[PDB]
Design a protein around this ligand. Sequence first.
Ligand SMILES: Nc1nc2c(ncn2[C@@H]2O[C@H](COP(=O)(O)OP(=O)(O)OP(=O)(O)O)[C@@H](O)[C@H]2O)c(=O)[nH]1
Ligand SMILES: CN[C@@H]1CCc2c(ccc(O)c2O)[C@H]1O
Lengths: 52, 331, 282, 231
Amino acid sequence: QARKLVEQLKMEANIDRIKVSKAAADLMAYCEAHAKEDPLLTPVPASENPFR
Amino acid sequence: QLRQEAEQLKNQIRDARKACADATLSQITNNIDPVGRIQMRTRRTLRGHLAKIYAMHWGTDSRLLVSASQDGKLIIWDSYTTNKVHAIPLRSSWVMTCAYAPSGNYVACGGLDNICSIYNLKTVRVSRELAGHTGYLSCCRFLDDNQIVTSSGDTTCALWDIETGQQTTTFTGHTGDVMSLSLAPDTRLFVSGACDASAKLWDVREGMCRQTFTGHESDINAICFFPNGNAFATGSDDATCRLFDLRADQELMTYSHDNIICGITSVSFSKSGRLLLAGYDDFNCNVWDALKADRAGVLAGHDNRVSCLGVTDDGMAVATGSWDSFLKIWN
Amino acid sequence: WVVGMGIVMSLIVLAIVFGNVLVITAIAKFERLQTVTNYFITSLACADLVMGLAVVPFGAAHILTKTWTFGNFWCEFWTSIDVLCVTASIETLCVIAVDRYFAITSPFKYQSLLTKNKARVIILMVWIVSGLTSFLPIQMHWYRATHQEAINCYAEETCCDFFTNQAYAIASSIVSFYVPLVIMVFVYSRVFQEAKRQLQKIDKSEGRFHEHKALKTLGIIMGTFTLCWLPFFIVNIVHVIQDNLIRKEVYILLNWIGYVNSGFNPLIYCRSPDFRIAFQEL
Amino acid sequence: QRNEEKAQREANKKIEKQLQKDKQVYRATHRLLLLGAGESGKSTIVKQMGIFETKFQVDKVNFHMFDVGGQRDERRKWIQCFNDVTAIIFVVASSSYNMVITNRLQEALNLFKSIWNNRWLRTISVILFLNKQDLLAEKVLAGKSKIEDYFPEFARYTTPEDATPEEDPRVTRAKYFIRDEFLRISTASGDGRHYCYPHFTCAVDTENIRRVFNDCRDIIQRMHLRQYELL
Ligand SMILES: Nc1nc2c(ncn2[C@@H]2O[C@H](COP(=O)(O)OP(=O)(O)OP(=O)(O)O)[C@@H](O)[C@H]2O)c(=O)[nH]1
Ligand SMILES: CN[C@@H]1CCc2c(ccc(O)c2O)[C@H]1O
């Protein structure tokens, strides 16, 4: 139990971490690129709305 | 000796995360325009359940869905024309989860009997029963037509083989009840939120834990992947939601308000990932902004606690269920 | 004093048509208030609304102007509507009392005893029996009196008064008032007995560590209805048994005091957290 | 097109007709939840009269009881599902004041306090069975073990005047002290929305089903009386 827990923390410690300014920028870029096909943001006309 | 080494390593992990925080997500997205105001109205209301509802899953075709209720029924609906298609009675009246196959051929179920049952829609009779868990089932998701991942109250998750009914692999490491899980878009990794206020990222092929996130303070109730696949969100019963990044291995933003003190039962994202929809214990649902952490809408058409919430694959409608035995479609 | 009298009679019309519409809209708009018990309340509210819309204004105008101008046919139609609305409102209170009696005395079989179809059938039956008592005998001139003053009253077109024979007065009074009174008295006696028995049971087990409400509620429910409707239905028999004892002004005053009861039902049968929340939301 | 539209509406009617028959059975049955302190002898009570379910009918009334044995933990996350039951049945071994297993009665009292003070179980009554009475009587008349050693409040306690013993005063005093230890917690927290019904139970009693029936009848009657503002 104790030996297994020690190995797990060592395994998780040796990974590559990138800075937050890259992850936030990537999230913002994805949202800006795919905001066009978001029917919940921009309402669709009633002609093309199957529920109304 | 061994205990000292574990404490020393926990400091090394924390120290590395501090060096990667150039800035916060809030600072970068200050110049982006606000989403504004969002108003939604109920389009359909589904009736027929005799008791309070626990689970709900949309279909891949974005037209059919399934729901489970405490009275012992598993009704498949038609969201467009509001017509019941199937009604499967259950052996056990205590059901806590349900799922719908990607191909639409099967439906899964489970609950307090520690068993997962698979039904054959296009044949409706019981096709398979999976046993081996020592606690109540909490969630289940379909990898494909012949695989399924389940989480239970014995602090373990498993990957099953429906053809032979055997656990291909088992995932261990949590110290509390596992409450929810969610699959990656490519179906190669998944995350689980447990009762020890921690979330873990697993590997289906290898069967090992890779990263652990411990930002919350109480029981974690819901979890959901960002559409990109490089982030996820969680919801606990301390009235807070948090956004975690896999490549940075740390929390990015928190969504909380001073007038909310009730717990959170379910979370979900939008088609583009800009909006975050979360259900609460105060009988209504709130809509957040993922990049700015501010409220944008309220869905307050239910009379009892909201227990489930889902968004279609094409992102046209949002379905919610509650304890008053009614489903509603919001568009 | 005609100006002052019209002001008061205008306030009675508004009070009846405001609370009763509020009850109907609140039940219809929402979905948590649609139970078996509320159908009887809806029927009672509809009867009270019809009364307050089609009885009080015409009677007030007839009293103030001292002359009926709408002709004989509308006089008789107004009398028929008046009798129908009075009869169909008192009989719903008996239904509510019996519903509570069955709910409390026999709790295991209450769900099987009362259903939506049975409630609808009961309401339709009550309204049919109310209609048979009012329109059928009046419109066929079976209620008419035989003395000379009655003949002159029915002959004149400007005059619209109430004259009736002994048999019709006795039968209508009995059907409209006397059976529901004794039924409700018996029902509420049993309910009070059950309530005090449960109160005694609770005290014995938990007396060391620890009937005003029931008495007050039953007193309100019985007293309002009795004080509103008893003197009129007494003088209804009295004035026909003895011709010269009762005048007409007292008759009208007691009938109007009875009419006033229609404005109190929302204040009695609609005092619950759910109804108050619904009222606040609107 | 038009042909498929009628086909869907035909299958809906068949389903909606079946749900009407099922609603009659659902509303005419009563659900009970059975708990235990760990060694309270609750299985003996059930047998004599994942999840285990039993069905029985008394006086043409249908009852259906649930027993949970597949889950054993100090945290009960699943307890929130049973917020629509008629009553909860709590079984405790009253003859275990000297069993350290810290003793068992203290753990049972803590479990009762936790169950009573719950966010979801705020309108549910409890039928309490104080099991193993003969063992308690024997261990009291033995005189080797004293309750005041483990419960010092027993030093200053007297049998209530409104008591109905059948016997030797010591067992009556012990029984009433033990039941008051539960009645105190029951009365302190409650606000009149739910009560507790304590009973003394042994291994030879055959009248437990009658007690459950009468307690459920009282529960429903009190519910209706409180709803109609008559109590
Ligand atoms: N004298 C007496 N003995 C009892 C009583 N109830 C149980 N026992 C003893 O309990 C023994 C059997 O254990 P059970 O009663 O089945 O205990 P259990 O069912 O495992 O109880 P739980 O683990 O809490 O579910 C019997 O041999 C009895 O001696 C009782 O009411 N009186
Ligand atoms: C003109 N007013 C009428 C006269 C007689 C009468 C009324 C109500 C119910 C009855 O059963 C009656 O017989 C009164 O409303």
